[PDB]
Design a protein around this ligand. Structure first.
Ligand SMILES: CCOC(=O)c1cn[nH]c1
Length: 182
């Protein structure tokens, strides 16, 4: 409906796949080459389904900060025959607060879903499902089961992936440029 939704749609159309693990279906953001991200609670194994294609996982790493605290981001390298558009230049370099963010989801349950979530707080520490977590972004929208892995964007920036909610607020794990240097 406006430039927020336009950027979000462009990221969804070229840089997302539907990932299925034994824990469910997730929006999965492709970042560059065969490298993508997914919430760590997806419990990625040796094999994953990507748009219903059986796919070998070449490498997977659950990120933690240098305090050895969960970040809830798993980086996956996929044995896929096609590279993602490189979007690393849209990733923030530093922890920050944001205005006017969109959360976008694409699954069998929620196809072509875009939610204007508004102001995004650098929340920091969250006890996420009992697990102490750092670098959490917070927004005031009642997000639901099925939106995890959803991409959080502003105009011109890909800032996080949805990892949970409490019924009133939603929470995303930050994406930072430094995660994807090669
Ligand atoms: C289909 C209706 O959707 C909602 O009301 C919603 C989705 N997430 N949070 C609220």
């Amino acid at each position: 409906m406006g430039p927020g939704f336009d950027f979000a749609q462009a990221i969804m159309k070229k840089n997302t796949v539907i990932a299925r693990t034994e824990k469910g279906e997730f929006t999965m953001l492709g970042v560059y080459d065969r490298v993508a991200v997914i919430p760590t609670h997806a419990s990625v194994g040796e094999i994953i389904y990507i748009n219903d294609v059986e796919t070998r996982v070449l490498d997977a790493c659950a990120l933690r900060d240098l305090t050895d605290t969960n970040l809830e981001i798993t980086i996956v390298k996929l044995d896929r025959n096609q590279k993602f558009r490189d979007i690393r230049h849209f990733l923030p370099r530093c922890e920050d607060d944001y205005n006017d963010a969109v959360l976008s989801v694409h699954t069998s349950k929620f196809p072509n879903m875009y939610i204007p979530v508004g102001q995004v707080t650098n929340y920091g520490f969250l006890n996420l499902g009992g697990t102490p977590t750092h670098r959490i972004l917070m927004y005031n929208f009642p997000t639901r089961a099925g939106q995890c892995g959803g991409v959080v964007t502003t105009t011109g920036k890909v800032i996080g992936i949805h990892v949970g909610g409490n019924g009133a607020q939603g929470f995303a794990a930050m994406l930072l440029h430094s995660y994807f240097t090669d």
